[PDB]
């Protein structure tokens, strides 16, 4: 036999509209349409009727725009932060194929789409033909990006750290907030060096924190290891840093999204001595998706 | 503009710092294994020769004689006060003390050589460690001619 009916969604601007990509599990890359907070979603629900002769008895057809946050792949732990409905058909029949117009006016999309370890945030259109025992359901995924402008305050990070009477350094990164294709311009200045340093590197670390209160799970992933020194410095030596963030394709910093999860980035500076002992200093940086002019 | 050539501006390095010798010099040699005693008393000692320029070490050069038990005492003291994960010693080989083996037992040369390297391995790790250099036991071991086991651990 097969299926009696097949649901297909086609957006009104399905030719001109820009798409975007998403890294899922095992290195797979999906491509869905791109949307922005405030935009209207509109199109056609097209029902292909497959079994000619037969009839489809339903108790109503609808389409939903859905934005939600899924935790630990646990269906019971899904949380919808946006839900809009358009009833397309009353209870009735379908003998042949038919389409239905829909439009969701100026749709609020407060958060950016994200697929992590213990968290997913996704938007989609869900068409539902309601039947007596089992609904025909079709999901249709969308990407939402949250944009921002150049920040009001952006101070350089500058810090004197060390181990007492062994190593003193002063590191400086040129900003606190870097856009996704920005550049870490910085320097490491050595004030006291009484250990034997083999090499030094800057690392980019992405923490994904899930849960509420004492319920807290942090998933850490070391996105970049970037060597910046090779060999022993002496005091008074300055080492330059120029690390292009474009190379590693990170997400924006996302802080307490719906009071459910965070995603934060850190600059972990690490020096390594001759006996492989490892001295470090972590510093949070905010990432943000820059709005291109237009 | 065709290339992003941005760097932060640097302070010129003072020429004394730039050329003058580095301040992280520390080498410890374990050498010259020697029997001390006769008969059942016998044990091997090694020369622990230090060269440094770190202010914390109270002699720039030192030479002392140490026993493998002393190395165990150092490691044992560091495991209590220091809170440093201390590296391993090359190992107490008890069954080498047993009589009528097919080798010279505790005074076998392939043994003493291999142990000697392990102690050099151990002491250079321990002595290079920052948190370890504070503790009184390390200086006591490297630079006092005899260790005073009845001591109160400081620093």
């Amino acid at each position: 036999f097969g299926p009696i009916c097949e649901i297909d969604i086609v957006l009104n601007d399905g030719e001109t509209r820009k798409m975007a990509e998403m890294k899922t599990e095992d290195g797979k890359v999906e491509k869905h349409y791109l949307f922005y907070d405030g935009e209207s979603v509109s199109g056609k629900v097209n029902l292909a009727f497959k079994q000619p002769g037969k009839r489809l008895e339903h108790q109503g057809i609808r389409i939903e725009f859905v934005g939600q946050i899924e935790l630990f792949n646990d269906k019971s732990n899904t949380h919808e932060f946006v839900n809009l409905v358009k009833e397309l058909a009353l209870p009735g029949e379908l003998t042949q194929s038919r389409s239905y117009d829909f439009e969701f006016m100026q749709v609020e999309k407060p958060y950016e789409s994200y697929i992590g370890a213990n968290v997913r945030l996704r938007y989609f259109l869900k068409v539902t033909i309601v039947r007596r025992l089992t609904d025909l359901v079709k999901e249709y995924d969308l990407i939402v990006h949250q944009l921002a402008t150049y920040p009001d305050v952006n101070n350089s990070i500058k810090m004197e750290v060390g181990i007492e009477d062994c190593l003193h350094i002063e590191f400086e990164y040129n900003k606190s907030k870097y856009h996704l294709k920005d550049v870490i311009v910085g320097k490491i200045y050595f004030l006291l060096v009484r250990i034997k340093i083999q090499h030094m590197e800057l690392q980019l670390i992405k923490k994904e924190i899930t849960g509420i209160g004492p319920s807290t799970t942090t998933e850490t992933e070391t996105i970049a290891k970037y060597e910046i020194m090779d060999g022993a410095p002496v005091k008074g030596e300055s080492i330059p840093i120029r690390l292009f963030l474009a190379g590693y394709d990170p997400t924006p910093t996302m802080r307490d999204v719906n009071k459910k999860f965070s995603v934060r980035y850190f600059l972990n500076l690490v020096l390594v001595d001759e006996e492989d002992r490892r001295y470090f200093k972590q510093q949070e940086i905010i990432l943000w998706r820059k709005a291109p002019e237009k | 503009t065709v290339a992003d050539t941005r760097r932060l501006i640097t302070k010129p390095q003072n020429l004394n710092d730039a050329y003058g010798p580095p301040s992280n010099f520390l080498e410890i040699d374990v050498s010259n294994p020697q029997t001390v005693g006769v008969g059942r008393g016998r044990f091997t000692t090694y020369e622990i020769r230090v060269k440094t320029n770190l202010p914390i070490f109270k002699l720039k050069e030192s030479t002392v004689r140490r026993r493998y038990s002393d190395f165990e005492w150092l490691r044992s003291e560091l495991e209590r006060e220091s809170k440093v994960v201390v590296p391993p010693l090359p190992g107490k080989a008890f069954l080498r003390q047993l009589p009528f083996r097919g080798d010279d037992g505790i005074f076998d040369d392939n043994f003493i050589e291999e142990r000697k390297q392990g102690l050099e391995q151990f002491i250079n790790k321990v002595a290079g460690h920052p948190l370890a250099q504070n503790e009184r036991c390390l200086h006591m071991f490297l630079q006092d001619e005899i260790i005073d086991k009845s001591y109160t651990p400081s620093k």
């Binding site: 004197e160 060390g162 181990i163 350094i169 490892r278 001295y279 470090f280 200093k281 | 440093v84």
Partner: peptide, 10 residues
């Protein structure tokens, strides 16, 4: 396995 020491502010 490999020692990791946090650098303190002065």
């Amino acid at each position: 396995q490999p020692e990791l020491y946090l650098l303190n502010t002065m």
